[PDB]
Every structure is written in C-alpha cells, then in structure tokens.
Amino acid sequence: ITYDKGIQTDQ
Amino acid sequence: STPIVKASDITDKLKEDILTISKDALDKYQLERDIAGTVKKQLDVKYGNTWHVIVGKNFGSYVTHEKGHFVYFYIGPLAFLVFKTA
C-alpha cells in the first residue's frame, strides 16, 4: 500500500 | 542538534532509528551523497529493501512510498528525505 508525497526545503 | 520533523508517515521506533542513524551519518561523512548512502544502506540491512535517501539544503521532491515508511526532517540546515518502496 502506497501514498504519494511532495516536499519542499525552506531554503 | 535535535532533528526537526517536518512531515512523516512512520512508527515511533522506526523514526527514532532513522534519526539516530542520520545523526551518526553527519559525524562520519562530509558529502551529502555519502551521508545519504550510509543511511540508505543501514536501513536496507535493518529494515529490508528498498530505501531511498535525499540529503540537501535546496530541493523539492515528489515520491511514492510504502505506508508507514516515510519521514522528512532537518538536522540543522540540512534536510533529509528518507522513504521505502517495495
């Protein structure tokens, strides 16, 4: 079972 | 420096292990690539394949991970993206 995830550094 | 967890889908034990392995990684290596590599390899051995690790100060990412195997956190200015696939 999977999920998708997007992340973004603050700098 | 105590890690700052920004996002996670993970159990407590696995999280503490990742954070511990990642702190030790920073003392061992200077290059982001090598830091990521030692985290990835240790997790593969302890928790099974297949782990992927990104370590850096500037990146955006979009990934697919196994349920309960995702954490994104900072240690100081350095961001860590750690996740497992099948």
UniProtKB/Swiss-Prot annotation, chain A:
It is found in: Cytoplasm, Cytoskeleton. Present with 752 molecules/cell in log phase SD medium. Interacts with NUM1, when DYN1 is present. Required for viability in the absence of the kinesin-related CIN8 mitotic motor. May be a dynein intermediate chain. This is WD repeat-containing protein PAC11. It comes from Saccharomyces cerevisiae (strain ATCC 204508 / S288c). The gene is PAC11.
Curated annotation (Swiss-Prot), chain B:
It is found in: Cytoplasm, Cytoskeleton; Nucleus, Nuclear pore complex. Gene3D superfamilies: Protein Inhibitor Of Neuronal Nitric Oxide Synthase. InterPro entries: DLC_sf (IPR037177), Dynein_light_1/2_CS (IPR019763), Dynein_light_chain_typ-1/2 (IPR001372). One of its GO terms (cellular component) is nuclear periphery. Coiled coil: none annotated. Keywords: Cytoplasm, Cytoskeleton, Dynein, Microtubule, Motor protein, mRNA transport, Nuclear pore complex, Nucleus, Protein transport, Translocation, Transport. GO terms for biological process: establishment of mitotic spindle localization; establishment of mitotic spindle orientation; mRNA transport; nuclear migration along microtubule; nuclear pore complex assembly; nucleocytoplasmic transport; protein transport. Pfam families: Dynein_light. Its main location: cytoplasm. Signal peptide: none annotated. GO terms for molecular function: dynein intermediate chain binding. Acts as one of several non-catalytic accessory components of the cytoplasmic dynein complex that are thought to be involved in linking dynein to cargos and to adapter proteins that regulate dynein function. Cytoplasmic dynein 1 acts as a motor for the intracellular retrograde motility of vesicles and organelles along microtubules. May play a role in changing or maintaining the spatial distribution of cytoskeletal structures. Also a component of the nuclear pore complex where it may contribute to the stable association of the Nup82 subcomplex with the NPC. Present with 1310 molecules/cell in log phase SD medium. Belongs to the dynein light chain family. This is Dynein light chain 1, cytoplasmic. It comes from Saccharomyces cerevisiae (strain ATCC 204508 / S288c) (Baker's yeast).
